[PDB]
Amino acid sequence: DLAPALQALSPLLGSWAGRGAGKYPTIRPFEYLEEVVFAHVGKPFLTYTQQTRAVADGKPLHSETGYLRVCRPGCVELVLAHPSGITEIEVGTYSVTGDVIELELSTRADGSIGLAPTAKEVTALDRSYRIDGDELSYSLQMRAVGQPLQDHLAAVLHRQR
Ligand code: HEM
Ligand SMILES: [C-]#N
Numbered sequence: 001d002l003a004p005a006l007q008a009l010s011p012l013l014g015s016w017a018g019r020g021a022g023k024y025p026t027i028r029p030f031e032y033l034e035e036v037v038f039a040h041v042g043k044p045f046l047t048y049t050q051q052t053r054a055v056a057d058g059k060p061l062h063s064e065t066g067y068l069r070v071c072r073p074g075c076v077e078l079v080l081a082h083p084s085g086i087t088e089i090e091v092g093t094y095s096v097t098g099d100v101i102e103l104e105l106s107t108r109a110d111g112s113i114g115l116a117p118t119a120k121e122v123t124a125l126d127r128s129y130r131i132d133g134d135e136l137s138y139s140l141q142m143r144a145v146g147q148p149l150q151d152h153l154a155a156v157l158h159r160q161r
Pocket of ligand 2: 062084
């Protein structure tokens, strides 16, 4: 069933829901609700989909979809499409410390950003993920629209039954 390469990341599999917040120098701060699904099809990658919506009115905000590849155990390539007209490849590493997994990725570690002609200018994205039992937390830093690399997002999600 599960590819041997994915064994360390098996706790990621399933549905996650929670809430986060974000900011950037060029915008007003915001909050969001988030739903994530990790799945697989028997190969050395997870499938991944995210949908976010406004806490106030449940209006859809951001989504993202793609794949978490294991480039040999310990190595990850996160490959994503964004509905804002942007593609992202983040590269990095993970550690297992008992029930804690830590993933550290960046477009800056031989990753990629692609921009559609009508997209906003994003030039780097960094992601830090922590899975501690039934809790998934992350921060995302962004270099974009004239601003240095800095926080855009962070959230805390919980495993769904
Ligand atoms: C949970 C995921 C995310 C949420 C809820 C979110 C939410 C928002 C919101 C509400 C804004 C301000 C309103 C707007 O410009 O549409 C914004 C701006 C922005 N976001 Fe995000 N975002 C998320 C992820 C991302 C990702 C992954 C990227 C890059 C791929 C990104 C890039 C930007 C940029 C470039 C801006 C515009 C800044 C400007 O116009 O100066 N966001 N985000
Ligand atoms: C982010 N839109």
